[PDB]
């Protein structure tokens, strides 16, 4: 018999993104080639099958630095990290291949699905 | 020119609640009278003006235990913590006064607004 506030989840995610932009309570650095990205482990886990596996591991859960596979493109990662914190995906002709490959590696099934759909159309 | 995944914020919050139920990456205990509640500091901050103030404080940001005012009812807190992680508010005739008082203390303005509306109707 609960009532529901429609905008609550969106407002929570917006505040988590504000914390990210101000570098508040970020507890991990994701290293992609030369580039470094600060984030919240819980948000990464909530969005990605790969980060979920990493941070539920009894040894890796305690690491402050995570290095991604050298094949991962920093721009593709940046676009996906923005999507995690906003629900908005900056998908473009020039980045779609790098975004799909990064989403497959990060195990973000809904992003992989839209990339496959957009590629098929062209 | 971004695209948006409508269900993303809700899915993120659902996974954060799953992490909470399994006590994964919880980094704070909220003490309310004799009762203890484990949570994620970032989620508390995203939902509450009070926790936002507490965890942006350079000294309090590092505390693993937070004790609430002794006037706060554990059940009212529990209902509000559930709302933070689900968007669902278990508002009932027998708990509405304790929920409104706890939401005013936690600075959860949308919950305070619905409690004031529901009280006015009765």
């Amino acid at each position: 018999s609960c009532i529901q506030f429609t905008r609550h989840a969106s407002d929570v995610l917006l505040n988590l993104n504000r914390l990210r932009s101000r570098d508040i309570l970020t507890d991990v650095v994701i290293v992609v080639s030369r580039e470094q990205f600060r984030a919240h482990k819980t948000v990464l886990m909530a969005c990605s099958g790969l980060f979920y596996s990493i941070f539920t591991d009894q040894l890796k859960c305690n690491l402050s630095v995570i290095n991604l596979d050298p094949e991962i493109n920093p721009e593709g990662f940046c676009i996906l990290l923005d999507f995690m914190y906003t629900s908005r995906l900056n998908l473009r002709e020039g980045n779609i291949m790098a975004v799909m490959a990064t989403a497959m590696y990060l195990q973000m099934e809904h992003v992989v699905d839209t990339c496959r759909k957009f590629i098929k159309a062209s | 020119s971004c695209i948006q995944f409508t269900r993303h914020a809700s899915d993120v919050l659902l996974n954060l609640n799953r992490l909470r139920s399994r006590d994964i990456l919880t980094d704070v205990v909220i003490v309310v009278s004799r009762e203890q509640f484990r949570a994620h500091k970032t989620v508390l901050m995203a939902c509450s003006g009070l926790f936002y103030s507490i965890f942006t404080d350079q000294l309090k940001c590092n505390l693993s235990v937070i004790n609430l005012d002794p006037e706060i009812n554990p059940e009212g807190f529990c209902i509000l913590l559930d709302f933070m992680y689900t968007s669902r508010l278990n508002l009932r005739e027998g708990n509405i006064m304790a929920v409104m008082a706890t939401a005013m203390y936690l600075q959860m303005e949308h919950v305070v607004d619905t409690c004031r509306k529901f009280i006015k109707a009765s």
Binding site: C2, I3, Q4, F5, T6 | R88, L89, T114
Partner: peptide, 4 residues
């Protein structure tokens, strides 16, 4: 607020 809605009835979910």
């Amino acid at each position: 607020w809605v009835i979910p």
